[PDB]
């Protein structure tokens, strides 16, 4: 019930919530408990997970289990939350990657079908050559 | 010494071209100019044109056997200097670059030659055209940022894989 | 019912800022009223879900950009309204107009890298000349 | 009397004598200044040998020692001897000096040097730095709201 996004947030959705990685549990909990009437606690493998632990390695941790607790202090029924896979996390970074990637040779093949490598060795070379000549009969060159 | 000046072209190649006026009529035997045109390689030696130019010019009289008249180039530096027969005609050239005029003697002919040494718009005419096709060709980027986000990107990914503790390549 | 998008970070909706909480939204909209939550569509393979207060303005309408519209729940009368949310499109434009003018700008304007490393050398060429000469060189 | 000139290119011109001109490379061995010279000079029948000394307390570099490495110890005494195997009297050529030998290849780096700021000073009247920080910037947002909406962009 929580979902990467293709920014570098979270997004979690539960009886809808945004969070970043490297942001504790505590926030979590502060989140939470302003939708409702009060202690949350993280249980996952089992453990329980301390709110001064990063979110990004608790799902990261929760892995094992595919799904971690959320028990509220109060209520009886515990929630579950499906945790992302590794792929799962990293859907739209690896396709940026992918992307770019694409671009990329798209990019170099482009500089291979003008010959371009040798037309800088060419133009360098006699631009050289000018140069070189310009000082040979004492002028200048642009 | 003599009124004709010769003149030395470019090529978009290596070569040279050496226009000179000879003194000599075309059947004539022995020793007012007629035109040789004469394409060269920078790394042929002096040696080489004195050979190509005996072969175009009759040959000199000594007693009763022709001889091979002696061609001998000179430059100036403000007196004159005589160049070995050795030196390759190019680095002959690049050095008389501004005097503007090197001169060529014929054995048995009073009056020398003068080649006029090309300007350095001349001399470097067709490249210089070249670097403007070349220049205009490349103009028609974010390479550098683009190729530094991928391998970054490349990086956090490996990363998670480690931490989410899977293997991960394409 | 439209939102849509400025040249500046702002933002720009009407009815009958991306930092700011939705908490926000509704506290300034209660100035022109006599309880305002917000919702959306929600894919898992369609699905309503209510947003915290919590949440940035920016950052909620993010993640509605495939269903180009959301739900807004007022107090009173169970007759919600719909934003208009603008397509890619829509949004990009200012900057995309702001890109190709760049771009271009770039366009109008490299033997840096040949000029740079041929120094390096002939400024290495002349220190060893200086060495094997036994002289100080400076520029 | 005899002069060792540095040229534009790495080459050496030589001019000793009715002065006589040669090209050769710092990079050559003595024996092809001995060989071009035996052939501008009459014989004694054999070739004379040709004998290079500089200054140290006078003595004499192996034909196989490099031309280049021959003239910068040579400018200690600014000038070095030749002695043509038969001809009683010496030639001395004044061999170039350090900024003599560097004065193209020193006069090479300011040009570029110079031409180095004016592309730079160029990048920077242009506010070259934010125009791609800006354009590779707000490429990259827009890059991620295609991303956001799905779309090709």
Redesign the interface.
């Known amino acids: 019930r929580l979902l990467t996004?293709?920014?570098r947030?979270l997004?979690l959705?539960l009886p809808?919530?945004?969070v970043h990685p490297q942001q504790p549990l505590s926030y979590l909990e502060r989140?939470i408990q302003?939708?409702i009437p009060p202690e949350i606690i993280f249980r996952a493998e089992w453990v329980r997970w301390s709110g001064s632990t990063e979110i990004g390695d608790f799902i990261?941790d929760a892995?094992r289990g595919r799904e971690f607790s959320v028990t509220i202090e109060g209520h009886a029924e515990e929630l579950r939350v499906a945790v992302p896979?590794?792929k799962d996390?990293?859907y739209?970074?690896?396709?940026?990657?992918?992307?770019?990637?694409q671009?990329?040779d798209q990019?170099a093949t482009v500089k291979r079908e003008a010959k371009?490598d040798q037309?800088?060795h060419?133009?360098?070379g006699?631009?050289?050559?000018?140069?070189?000549?310009?000082?040979?009969?004492?002028?200048?060159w642009d």
Request: aromatic share 10%.
């Open positions: 996004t293709p920014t947030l997004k959705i809808a919530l945004l989140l302003a939708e990261r892995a896979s590794f996390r990293t739209y970074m690896r396709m940026r990657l992918r992307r770019m990637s671009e990329i990019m371009w037309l800088v060419d133009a360098n006699l631009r050289r050559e000018i140069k070189f000549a310009a000082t040979e009969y004492g002028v200048e």
